[PDB]
Amino acid sequence: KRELLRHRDYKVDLESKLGKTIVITKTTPQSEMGGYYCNVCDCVVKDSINFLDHINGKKHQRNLGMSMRVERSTLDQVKKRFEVNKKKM
RNA sequence: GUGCUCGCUUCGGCAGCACAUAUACUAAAAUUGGAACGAUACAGAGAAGAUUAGCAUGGCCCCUGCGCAAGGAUGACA
């Protein structure tokens, strides 16, 4: 039982820690280590684009109970999305 | 199905007759798994002897001292 893949509604904080230096000792955990950390995956990745590859990967989405299948939206959903933005602006 | 029986029988039909004789990895679809030497991260002298300083031992030749063994020549009246 795997749910369908859902588009992330939150922006990714790839740029958040530019210039912010991290002093790394032996006792420091992977959470505060340099780079990007998948709290769901418990893995460290040291690129923004490689972290994006991770959070777009089969294993990361599997750990979230997802799959590599995207919902097939219908006519009314797209039309109502159009009307929703028309109302919002 | 086509055509034919001097058949029943009517052109509405029926019974029999000649030919037709055994296709398919068969598949459209089902699903969950395991996965780089590709990137970034680290290191990166990515080919050398893996050394040189003394003293003592060992070999050869003298010199000196002590010991052992066997010896050579010489010296001393009252």
Curated annotation (Swiss-Prot):
Transmembrane segments: none annotated. A zinc finger (Matrin-type) spans 36-60. It is found in: Nucleus. There is a cross-link at K1, K11, K17, K20, K26, K58, K79 (Glycyl lysine isopeptide (Lys-Gly) (interchain with G-Cter in SUMO2)). Component of the spliceosome B complex. Involved in pre-mRNA splicing as a component of the spliceosome. This is Zinc finger matrin-type protein 2. The chain holds residues 45 to 133 of 199 of the full protein.
